[PDB]
Design a protein around this ligand. Structure first.
Ligand SMILES: CC(C)(C)C[C@@H]1N[C@@H](C(=O)N[C@H]2CC[C@H](O)CC2)[C@H](c2cccc(Cl)c2F)[C@]12C(=O)Nc1cc(Cl)ccc12
Length: 98
């Protein structure tokens, strides 16, 4: 299911940034129906939201220490409300399109 999710915590133009997920993150997105190689950050957040629900990882905390998401983010858990922190962890797993 294609879509996008935006937040008031991140600048609008930043959520429009075109990105190329690295192979593990790309594989994760394709496991929940993504089909392309290039995305906006807001589409990436939509697919990751679907992945968190499918894997049942969601006090508003996601527990991801025994999941591929935990390996990519480098944390055992995180608040779903701290959007800059989530953006920081996602940026480490992709290449911003030049
Ligand atoms: C509920 C989930 C299935 C857990 C998905 C979440 N939903 C967004 C979100 O902010 N919910 C909270 C709103 C306030 C409520 O009191 C508690 C939940 C969040 C969100 C939306 C836009 C941008 C950012 Cl950065 C963001 F975090 C959310 C999402 O869409 N995709 C995504 C990906 C990762 Cl990796 C973590 C958390 C989410």
């Amino acid at each position: 299911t294609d879509g996008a999710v935006t937040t008031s915590q991140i600048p609008a133009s930043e959520q429009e940034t075109l990105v190329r997920p690295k192979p593990l993150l790309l594989k994760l997105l394709k496991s929940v129906g993504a089909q392309k190689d290039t995305y906006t950050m807001k589409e990436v957040l939509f697919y990751l939201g679907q992945y968190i629900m499918t894997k049942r990882l969601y006090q508003h905390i996601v527990y991801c220490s025994n999941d591929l998401l935990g390996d990519l983010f480098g944390v055992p858990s995180f608040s779903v409300k701290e959007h800059r922190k989530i953006y920081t962890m996602i940026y480490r797993n992709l290449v911003v399109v030049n």
